[PDB]
């Protein structure tokens, strides 16, 4: 039995949606978030936008998670019925072999397994070197291209990992596919939920962007549609609390609070906004951790470059095994991220946003 929160997280992570194929996820997020929004719309690529007005002419605050999860796409059916695919999102070859996947065809779902050449047929050296993704295939038990086509398989079909939502013996730890970034979508939902019963001097947009995993694409189009004054990118961060990792390599720990990202490859955090958020956490007694993502980015990267620019900050959840069939995250970090963003939004009136944005006067002009 799962409570209201876990039920929602399970529904979100259960949804299937890779870049350019996010509809099912959008439908689930929409059902959960509309009760807390005055208006729900989408951009032309499919990003879900839920608007909640707290103050008619108040500043616009964008909270962005992303609907897409990393996956694969059918590209070819061999003469013998095997499926060739293309990775859509960043995948590490070493977590793919012998994994169960689901191909979503026009005729329904088809279960398959990712495979390669048997080890004994490879050279002792090649047996130690990682198999190349381009040399992998998916087996669905077909014996010819004709048969696979008859079953409904076609180039372009979405292929998604299959994994059952699992609550660990310590119920705070949750194992599931796509925490990246259904957890961010969840954060946007629950923040709007909190705003239904508390005043906020602004207009808040809970957003589920599309195609973040292929280049922060939906974030660009969604932000253009919204024209936000402030933005918070919510996503997952890499946890460094597993065997073999030193603090120098990854300092964050699950359960120690949401991560305040000071820097990532797509954006240098806005100091004014960053300081405002940190101050709020301290005042509210909310735990948090600082971190940086040298080789990664978040939707904030695209959002902050919209029009005249947008002061923004990324807040993430330290997660283990990102971009694999089963990631693990801590419920307290999730709940505290929601509380932190809610408390910050309550302070973001026009005056505060103007001063955070224009630091040399005439800010209210």
**Does the annotation place 213 within a ligand binding site?**
yes
**Residue found by looking up tokens 């962007």 in the block:** 209
Q: Which is nearer to Zn ion, 157 or 235 (CB)?
A: 235
Query: Smallest distance from the beta carbon of 180 to Zn ion, in angstroms?
Result: 4
- 159 near 93, Cβ under 8 Å? no
Q: Which is nearer to Zn ion, 83 or 261 (CB)?
A: 261
Query: Smallest distance from the beta carbon of 9 to Zn ion, in angstroms?
Result: 16
Instruction: Say whether 360 is catalytic.
Output: no
Query: Smallest distance from the beta carbon of 296 to Zn ion, in angstroms?
Result: 8
**Residue found by looking up tokens 């019925």 in the block:** 81
What residues line the site for Zn ion (CB under 5 A)? 180-181, 235
CA torsion sign, 314 to 318 to 323 to 329? negative
**Does the annotation place 330 within a ligand binding site?**
no
Q: Which is nearer to Zn ion, 22 or 235 (CB)?
A: 235
* Alpha-helical segments (H) within 199-263: 217-226
Q: Residues near 123 by Cβ (< 8 Å), separated by ≥ 6?
A: none
Of 4, 147, 212, 343, which is the active-site residue?
212
- How many CB atoms neighbour CB 279 within 10 A? 12
**Does the annotation place 120 within a ligand binding site?**
no
Q: Which is nearer to Zn ion, 300 or 342 (CB)?
A: 300
Query: Smallest distance from the beta carbon of 181 to Zn ion, in angstroms?
Result: 4
H or E stretch covering 24: helix 23-33
Q: Is 132 helix (H, G, I), strand (E, B) or coil?
A: coil
- 110 near 158, Cβ under 8 Å? no
Q: CA angle 263-268-272, nearest 5°?
A: 105
H or E stretch covering 105: strand 100-105
Binding site feature residues: 66, 180, 213, 235, 323
**Binding-site residues for a divalent metal cation, please?**
66, 180, 213, 235, 323
Active site residues: 212
């Amino acid at each position: 039995k799962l409570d209201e929160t876990l039920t929602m997280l399970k529904d979100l992570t259960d949804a299937k949606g890779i870049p350019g194929n996010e509809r099912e996820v959008r439908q689930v997020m929409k059902s959960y978030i509309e009760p807390f929004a005055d208006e729900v719309t989408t951009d032309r690529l499919g990003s879900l936008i839920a608007k909640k007005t707290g103050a008619e002419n108040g500043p616009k605050i964008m909270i962005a998670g992303h609907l897409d999860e990393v996956g694969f796409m059918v590209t070819q059916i061999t003469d013998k019925g095997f499926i060739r695919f293309q990775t859509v999102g960043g995948w590490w070859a070493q977590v793919m072999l012998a994994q169960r996947v689901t191909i979503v065809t026009k005729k329904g779902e088809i279960t398959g397994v990712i495979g390669s050449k048997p080890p004994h047929i490879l050279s002792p050296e090649a047996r130690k070197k990682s198999v190349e993704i381009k040399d992998m295939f998916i087996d669905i038990g077909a014996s010819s291209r004709e048969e696979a086509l008859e079953w409904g398989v076609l180039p372009g079909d979405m292929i998604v990992p299959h994994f059952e939502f699992t609550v660990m013996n310590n119920e705070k730890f949750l194992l599931a596919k796509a925490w990246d970034n259904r957890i961010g979508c969840a954060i946007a939902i629950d923040v709007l939920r909190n705003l239904q019963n508390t005043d906020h001097p602004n207009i808040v947009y809970g957003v589920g962007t599309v195609q973040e995993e292929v280049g922060l694409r939906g974030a660009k189009t969604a932000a253009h549609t919204i024209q936000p004054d402030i933005a918070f990118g919510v996503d997952v961060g890499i946890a460094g609390d597993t065997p073999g990792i030193s603090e120098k390599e990854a300092q964050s720990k699950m359960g120690k609070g949401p991560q305040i990202i000071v820097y990532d490859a797509s954006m240098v955090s806005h100091k004014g906004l960053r300081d405002a958020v940190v101050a709020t956490a301290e005042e509210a007694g909310i735990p948090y951790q600082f971190d940086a993502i040298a080789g990664g980015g978040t939707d904030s990267g695209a959002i902050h470059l919209t029009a005249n620019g947008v002061p923004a900050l990324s807040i993430t959840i330290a997660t283990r095994y990102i971009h694999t069939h089963a990631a693990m995250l801590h419920r307290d970090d999730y709940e505290n991220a929601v509380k932190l963003i809610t408390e910050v939004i309550k302070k973001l009136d026009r005056k505060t946003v103007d001063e955070i944005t224009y630091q040399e006067g005439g800010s209210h002009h």
